């Protein structure tokens, strides 16, 4: 016969298949996966920043300083929060945190955090500090929230106390105060002497006046009265003044915050770890250069986009058609 | 579709090393398989650019659209979840369709590449070869191992052979 | 001449045209429509589940049990609600439903619904039931909201009444109560004897205290006083206690709800029908396998996506080029 | 574009039954129209797969993004409507563009298919026929009704006829 | 040699390049830009409608009629608002505007606007008008907000005043009123005689009762008391009644509004101009037929979509491959 | 890709006036450059339709998704910004990808157009010319200035010249 030369293409031993718009399950020589399906299954640090586990405490009890909770005094920052949905500790004394939804959102993740003493606990005047069997500390001693001071009568007299805070930090500052509503007018007399006491809280943009709402609540622990805890973000250069003659949980510790609301409160019951990823889900940490993921719609950080899809194979090679 | 792959060249070559497109020859002195580094590398560069473009251009923020809510703000909680879900549905459809669309184009690109290679060889040989219509060319003259290379590297001259035909 | 064979393609008698990216109005042999344009023009059942028409009553009057409204006692479920925007019946007694926007949203569609008696209407103590000419029933007799009981003085005495509810249903339960604000301190004396009466409502997470806000309102029907109706979702295992000594519209009937907020409150004046579709719009029901629709942006259920577009024709056949 | 449909084959055939692509012959004994079930069915399968993919992949939730609001919560009501409208605008543009894009590709696919069929017949006949450049082939030898079928089914052998040419 | 004819294509002198999916920086003969990058750098009229600059006043002070602010009496419409973030004038008397966020949103842009006198300032009864050194006018004379009238005791007597408004305009009407909280019960006696005064505001859908919250606020200017300003949108055919015996900032001027919330409150410190565009950003006006823009995410009107991208070049010509 | 532009026709022609595709001739009486108004205008119409479609179909509302908020409603303010950002991210990716996709198709369209023009001329001449495989055709007979025009306007008849070949 004669000399001959032929043009051809690659064939391999592959079961690799892709779908095209015009055809299903087309054999190809090579392909890649677009969707990330692998994760750590743990809580990791997010881009170099460790989260904060709330232990046995709810966010509410943690943020007001429940003595049974681990203190947040040493915290500098957090990428996200880890909370047990059935946490035993919260507001140890029967009460509610006002507007806690917003606060949760703002404290989901903060890049700059530091507790600070707004007003000296003894600079208020002639009042005593109240502790309770409802808020015992790590020891067993009667105590109270770290961030608040329960002012009561001293020497059978409750004077009109008034202190103010000046935001000089240059950043936003979270302030907490509270109102105690006794079981009866008899108890507010026993605790604060003054009949029908009030608390007036004001900035230069708003002013709130609180009065007592006496009654018996179906409480927990030992008590049957009710506390309402409020909060406000004080902006740089702003000032907030507190004046009261009873039933007043005074501010002591506040928080200096910058770059906040950048996180998430995960309630997932997975384990914390030494790993570090750029994307954290409620199911595990993700570390991939892929831009899609079908693992968990609940994700935070520099993540691949979550999509509702099975694996997607991008063809790189050619149609794998077998040898003549 | 360009009719080459799984077309008139009805099968692929296992044992084609380090290439997608190539040549198979047979002269008096052997055989005879080699990839065409030129068209293969150019194709590799294109697929790489395509894959990188698809991935690198997604440089936005794609984590969840959600916030923290208490049990008394259910409506705003539901709207946030619905919006996050809707954004997710847009990306889901686009991801699936893009892969289907691009797989279509990738396969046809390969088909076009070997067809262009076949046409390139046919133009070289001109009347010095018979087109068998299966990707093969029957030479009308004898072809050195050197002669085969001049065909493979594009430098084959039909004038320096036209007479033995 | 010689024998010959030719290669060709299909041509037809079509005025069918499609647009391509490169060309407008290209003749093709066949094409399909992507957008659904046909609907029933009626209110249909949604995926096997019938809606609920509110008749001549607004949602507010329906949810508290306006005697002139048809009772919701027999309802088990609903896919969506149908409401007349100019409905004559609502809160028959001059008043407002607090946070009605949220409630409307949560009751737009519920998969599991059942009314239930939270607290026995006679288990409260020594009080009488108040009826009014403002809330007459189907007969013409003086009555009041079905879900609430208007407690008044009995034998010139209004005792401190206190009952509590325990959510044992395993599902979320909607509870309604109310505060009546008389025209003057004279009327609260006539109705409740006690000067400056109160109502205290509490769970283990929150507590509200209500006092009376006496004054003359520009009311309707006969009355000139004012009622405020509040509500709360009690979660499985939670309890809510009511204590009052006057001006208190006590809870009687609540609602056990599961899988809610899944609906819509349509106000469109179209007719209800025996048909059943997988997508309901404010203009009609849609039943199609197409994934797009340009009929109505207001749509609920397993719908095609609404898009702002005229009909879109997908080419299936080839370019219809006429015979040589 | 592949230059066949409305190109060198300048017109279509009415009375082409049960097919998109086909053959028209004429020997001493008649005429002579038949669809090519092979390339037609393969094309039908592709269009069907394309249409199904476009529709089946939209498996998300596409009803309105809205909630219930009273007359005192206008802002949140307006944001919900604006977001629903924005999501709608994304789907609107993608729907229109996809149809334009795919109609382009569908028409060109058909063009490619008949061009590949034409090339397929040309490769069969080789030197046994003259390519008239209009989709027709003039046979240099006589062709049975049986002979025409061997051309239509791909099994035509140019060696068993090359000499009458 | 022989006669010959050749087929070829265009080549040019271009450095013009585009990117394709398969290749970067491909030379082409011609291309167009998809993204608009040019703007006026000024505040322009938006589609024929001029905005409104708030001068030295915040929106709050402008909407209640701070005497130091330019009056909005002659305004007919506005496409958007221009506000200085550090505006010296606002609520001249120490106070807060309730729910100002919503109001800001609703007044960001209004197509039909006109101030109107709800109730005659002298038709209220036997009361005097109060002016203050905190709210001086353009002259230096003591005054007060234009939209409100500060009613005080006349001849040592503050009678129960009661007037009502009827929305007959056919459009939505914004109404403003206010409550003044004196520094002490002594001041409310000096100003209003009556001990524990009240204000009752009601429509046929809602009713609010206001009492005074006495106390000393850390105020500004001269004063140390506190004002709270409230508002409500009265719908066509609705009526709002005001009754009070002290501490009441009565409504005088309201606003008739149609097609509102269509704007934006820009705080950018750029200059206002005579130009007119169809798209206004916080950085300048945009006038282009292009559908994309990478200038500013903050944009209002008939705009190109903002995208996070460098310039995008659409190829029109062919690959520019140089001459043989 | 169709193998013409930067393919077998390895370079472009500067000094091709008022056209994208054209002809270059040489007979005994000169040279010899002219655009093909037919295929050029048709190509211009397509690019124009494409560009207009891309722009005209964006007829929705694309200004910011945002509202006015005070400093006490941070959460709803953040969700609004996140949603606006997310919608922006969808348009950003689609814009970039569409341009990459269409630039690919525009370039290949031009490649296809000149390839179809080349094939169109080859079909005219038939055996009356030698295909040099570089876009040029060597005529076997003499060609008037009139003859060149009949080739350019498609009306060249190979029968009225076949014999000088
Ligand atoms: C802190 O507040 C006081 C109270 O007026 C003020 O004088 C002082 O200027 C504020 N601090 C700073 C940093 O200005």
UniProtKB/Swiss-Prot annotation, chains A, C, E:
Annotated glycan sites: 13, 38, 166-167, 289
Cystine connections: 44-275, 57-69, 92-135, 279-303
Highest rank taxon of the organism: Viruses
Name of this protein: Hemagglutinin HA1 chain
Extracellular side: 3-324
């Amino acid at each position: 016969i004669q000399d001959r030369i032929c043009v051809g293409y690659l064939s391999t031993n592959s079961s690799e298949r892709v779908d095209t718009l015009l055809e299903n399950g087309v054999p190809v020589t090579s392909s890649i996966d677009l969707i990330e399906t692998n994760h750590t299954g743990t809580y990791c640090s997010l881009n170099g920043v460790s989260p904060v586990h709330l232990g046995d405490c709810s966010f509410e009890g943690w943020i007001v300083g429940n003595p049974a909770c681990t203190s947040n005094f040493g915290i500098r920052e957090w990428s996200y929060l880890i909370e047990d949905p059935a946490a035993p500790h919260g507001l140890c004394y029967p009460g509610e945190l006002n507007n806690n939804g917003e606060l949760r959102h703002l404290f989901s993740g903060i890049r700059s955090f530091s507790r600070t003493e707004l007003i000296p606990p003894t600079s208020w005047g002639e009042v005593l500090d109240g502790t309770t069997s409802a808020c015992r500390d790590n020891t067993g001693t009667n105590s109270f929230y770290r961030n608040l001071v329960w002012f009561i009568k001293k020497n059978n007299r409750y004077p009109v106390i008034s202190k103010t805070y000046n935001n000089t930090t240059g950043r936003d500052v979270l302030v907490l105060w509270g109102i105690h509503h006794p079981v009866s007018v008899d108890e507010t007399k026993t605790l604060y002497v003054n009949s029908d006491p009030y608390t007036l809280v004001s900035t230069k943009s708003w002013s709130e006046k609180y009065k007592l709402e006496t009654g018996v609540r179906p409480g927990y622990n030992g008590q049957r009265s009710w506390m309402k805890i409020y909060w406000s973000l004080i902006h740089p250069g702003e000032m907030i003044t507190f004046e009261s003659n009873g039933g007043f949980l005074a501010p002591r510790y506040g928080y200096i915050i910058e770059e906040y609301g950048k996180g998430r409160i995960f309630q997932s019951r997975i384990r914390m770890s030494r790993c570090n990823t750029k994307c954290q889900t409620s199911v595990g940490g993700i570390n991939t250069n892929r831009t899609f993921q079908n693992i968990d719609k609940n994700a935070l950080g520099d993540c691949p986009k979550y999509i509702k899809s099975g694996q997607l194979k991008l063809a790189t090679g050619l149609r794998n058609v077998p040898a003549i | 579709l360009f009719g080459a792959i799984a077309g008139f060249i009805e099968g692929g070559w296992p044992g084609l090393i380090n290439g997608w497109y190539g040549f198979q020859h047979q002269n008096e002195q052997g055989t005879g398989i080699a990839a065409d580094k030129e068209s293969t590398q150019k194709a590799i560069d294109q697929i790489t650019t395509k894959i990188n473009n698809i991935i690198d251009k997604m440089n936005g923020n794609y984590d969840s659209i959600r916030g923290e809510f208490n049990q008394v703000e259910k409506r705003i909680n539901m709207l946030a979840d619905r919006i996050d879900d809707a954004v997710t549905d847009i990306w889901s459809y686009n991801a699936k369709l893009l892969v289907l669309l691009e797989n279509d184009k990738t396969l046809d690109m390969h088909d076009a590449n070997v067809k262009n290679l076949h046409e390139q060889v046919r133009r070289e040989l001109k009347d010095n070869a018979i087109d068998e219509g299966n990707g093969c060319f029957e030479l009308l003259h004898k072809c050195n191992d050197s002669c085969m290379e001049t065909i493979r590297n594009g430098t084959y001259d039909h004038t320096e052979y036209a007479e033995e035909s």
